[PDB]
């Protein structure tokens, strides 16, 4: 695996709390399919059940602003809080920077 | 059972291109350990090894700033990109509705 994880979760009433797992994969070299050709897919075929769309669109809204920044050891991470539609939500980012 | 697709890549010299699935859990209703108690690890413990920390910074990078939206059917992605060192970085995200 290349892995890294961020947390994202809603204020008020009917608040979710959501982990999320991003599994990185490089795609300089393709894999093979059955006939030895390079296979495309992991280019452009995403995966799937989605989650909720406003859960979707809450985790990879833009946002420029930083309410700050924490830490432990040398791991650090970004808190971000937001509005959309009527919900504020906080995700929190892994930052080396 | 809940995954989202998101693409990364750099410009120039030993650009690179990435897939990133996002992978949701719902931390509403804790995993029971072997004794009947509530674990807690999902909620603070991270899933590793990482990728490459400037990989890392670049997917992670907060960014207000939308180049434009991409559309097939009724898919919506958003197509950002922003320097990070000395290097220009794209990020394309599923972006419900728009
Ligand atoms: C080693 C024991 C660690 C247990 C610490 C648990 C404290 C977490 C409490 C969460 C509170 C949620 N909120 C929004 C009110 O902050
Ligand atoms: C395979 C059926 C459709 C053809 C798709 C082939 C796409 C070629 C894309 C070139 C990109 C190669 N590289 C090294 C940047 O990954
Ligand atoms: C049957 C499907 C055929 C798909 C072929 C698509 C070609 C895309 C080539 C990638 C372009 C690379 N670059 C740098 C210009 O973005
Ligand atoms: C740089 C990525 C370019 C590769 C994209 C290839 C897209 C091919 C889509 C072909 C559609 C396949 N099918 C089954 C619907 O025919
Ligand atoms: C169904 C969603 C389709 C998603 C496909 C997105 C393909 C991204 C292409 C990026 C390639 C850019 N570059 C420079 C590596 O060619
Ligand atoms: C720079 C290369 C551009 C690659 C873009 C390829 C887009 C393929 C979209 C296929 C999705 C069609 N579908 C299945 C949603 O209907
Ligand atoms: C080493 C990483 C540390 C991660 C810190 C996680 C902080 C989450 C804070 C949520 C509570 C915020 N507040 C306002 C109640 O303090
Ligand atoms: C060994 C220490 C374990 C302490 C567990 C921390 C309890 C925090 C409860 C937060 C509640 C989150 N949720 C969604 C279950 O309500
Ligand atoms: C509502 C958010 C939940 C935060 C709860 C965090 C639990 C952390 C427990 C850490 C304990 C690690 N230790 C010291 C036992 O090894
Ligand atoms: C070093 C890993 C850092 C652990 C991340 C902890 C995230 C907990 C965020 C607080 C949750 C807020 N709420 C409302 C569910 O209590
Ligand atoms: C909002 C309250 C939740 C804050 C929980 C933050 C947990 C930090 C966990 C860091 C882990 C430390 N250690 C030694 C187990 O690695
Ligand atoms: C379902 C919609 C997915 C469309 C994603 C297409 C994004 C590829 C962009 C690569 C470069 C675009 N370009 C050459 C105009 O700059
Ligand atoms: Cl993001």
Known sequence: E?????????????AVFY??????????????DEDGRWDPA???????????????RA???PAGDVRGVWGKGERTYA????????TRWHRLLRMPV
């Open 59 to 61: 985790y990879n809204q």
């Open 79 to 86: 808190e971000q809080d937001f509005r959309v539609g009527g």
């Open 19 to 32: 982990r999320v797992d991003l599994h990185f994969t490089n795609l300089g070299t393709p894999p093979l």
């Open 42 to 56: 992991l280019m452009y075929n995403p995966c799937g059940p989605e989650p909720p769309a406003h859960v979707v």
């Open 2 to 14: 290349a892995c890294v994880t961020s947390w994202l979760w809603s204020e008020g009433e009917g």
